[PDB]
Design a protein around this ligand. Structure first.
Ligand SMILES: [Mg+2]
Ligand SMILES: [Mg+2]
Ligand code: NA
Length: 469
């Protein structure tokens, strides 16, 4: 019954509580006398022995740079827990389902992500949570399953979607003002320039707000607008990492318009960033009814940040090899169908196929596809390997002559007339339904030959059976 507390600074703290020397020993009975533990702004790196304090109702930890927090997983009699630090990532917290008398949970000012929720949504008696100041917390819907949750703080947190909230069984307070959507867990899109609009007569660039796909949606489906201010604090818009001056911006409910944009400027556009405020103010949206009974539901004035990568290329995708046979003929049009040649726009594809592919010399030929949809076509060309295969050709003798009542098998006959194809393709025959060999005369057996790719032109052999003396 004397307790292992490996951290000198941690034990030092605890001895100060018991009025003993900083380096004194501590007793399973001494641990059990403890009503609270408050570690703040001291470098404590391991919490072992805590697993020991079975009687604390208050654990309060701020900025201690602990490696993890595992050892708290079963303090059944703990009522109020608080752990804050810029380094407290979500992994450092164990699952908290043991904490069966916990009413209060504050993990504010930390570096948690969404994986924290599935550790804390199994808490039976938690009335309130503060996940305030966690920028990487982006969706709070998993907390709908907690039975007693009444109050939730997510101030300054990057949540964007409130659809589901009425699922909360007992919630009457959501504090959710000033989210910074895309602040920690970045939002990026890779996009075709076709999705934008360049007008050369006005020299204007238009960017449709329909691209801002992670924008705030209130619980009832309401989608607030971006502010229309072109002040740097309100809108921060970037082209190729260069901030565009307010004087050039015009903002509507549909999108944003830049003036003074040249054709060269537009073509050179590789990146945009849209960082702006959302127009959602005091008393400007619906509140669900749960929160109207003397609670509060503020989801106001969020901030949105959205990175863009712009692609002006038009690219062509098609099957990249094909096989025809030796001397049949194909028209470029039939060629393109076969390989399914397509521009990414739905414009034209040309080719040199008629130039490169030689149908009379079996082999493999490089066709290069090209396409010019644009005012111009920096449409990089994609190559296709067209393959010609040898025509499957039977060769044989054309006459053979046998005595009556000679016995002959089919395979003997094909051997006798040196019947053969150019590729290992099997010859079929009407031989044994055409020749008699009991009755003299002239019999015409036709040879044939087929494979996966072609049928040969049939060949005739004249089998003469002569009544010889
Ligand atoms: Mg801004
Ligand atoms: Mg109102
Ligand atoms: Na708090």
């Amino acid at each position: 019954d004397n307790v292992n507390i490996p951290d000198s600074t941690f034990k030092a703290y605890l001895n100060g509580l018991l009025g003993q020397a900083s380096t004194a020993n501590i007793t399973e009975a001494q641990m059990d006398s403890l009503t609270y533990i408050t570690l703040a702004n001291i470098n404590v790196t391991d919490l072992t022995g805590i697993e020991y304090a079975h009687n604390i109702k208050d654990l309060t930890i701020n900025n201690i740079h602990a490696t993890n927090y595992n050892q708290i997983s079963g303090l059944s009699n703990l009522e109020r827990l608080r752990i804050m630090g810029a380094d407290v990532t979500s992994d450092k917290i164990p699952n908290l389902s043991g904490l069966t008398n916990l009413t209060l949970l504050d993990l504010s000012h930390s570096a948690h992500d969404d994986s924290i929720l599935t550790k804390i949504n199994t808490l039976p008696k938690v009335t309130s949570i503060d996940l305030s100041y966690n920028g990487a917390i982006t969706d709070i819907m998993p907390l709908k399953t907690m039975p007693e949750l009444k109050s939730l703080n997510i101030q300054f947190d990057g949540v964007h979607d409130y659809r589901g909230i009425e699922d909360f069984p007992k919630l009457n307070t959501l504090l959710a003002y000033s989210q910074t959507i895309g602040g920690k867990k970045l939002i990026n899109s890779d996009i075709k320039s076709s999705k934008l609009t360049y007008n050369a007569e006005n020299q204007t660039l238009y960017v449709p707000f329909s691209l801002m796909t992670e924008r705030t949606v209130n619980y009832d489906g309401y989608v607030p607008d971006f502010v229309k201010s072109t002040a740097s604090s309100d809108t921060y818009f970037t082209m190729n990492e260069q901030q565009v001056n307010g004087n050039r911006l015009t903002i509507t409910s549909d999108g944003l318009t830049v003036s003074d944009v040249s054709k060269t400027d537009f073509d050179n556009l590789e990146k945009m960033e849209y960082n702006a405020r959302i127009d959602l103010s005091y008393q400007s949206y619906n509140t669900p009814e749960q929160f109207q009974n003397g609670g509060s539901y503020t989801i106001s004035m969020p901030i949105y940040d959205h990175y863009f990568t712009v692609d002006h290329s038009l690219n062509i995708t098609a099957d990249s090899e094909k096989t025809y046979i030796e001397n049949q003929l194909v028209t470029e049009a039939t060629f393109l169908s076969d390989i399914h040649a397509k521009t990414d726009d739905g414009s034209t594809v040309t080719s040199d196929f008629a130039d490169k592919v030689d149908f009379n010399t079996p082999g493999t030929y490089t066709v290069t596809l090209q396409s010019e949809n644009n005012a111009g076509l920096k449409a990089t060309p994609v190559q296709v390997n067209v393959t010609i295969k040898a025509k499957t050709t039977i060769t044989a003798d054309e006459k053979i002559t046998y005595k009556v009542d000679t016995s002959k098998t089919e395979a003997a006959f094909l051997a006798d007339i040196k019947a053969t194809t150019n590729d290992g393709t099997a010859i079929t025959s009407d031989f044994a339904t055409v020749v008699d060999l009991s009755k003299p005369g002239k019999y015409v057996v036709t040879l044939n030959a087929e494979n996966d790719l072609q049928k040969a032109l049939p060949v005739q052999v004249m089998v003469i059976v002569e009544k010889e003396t």
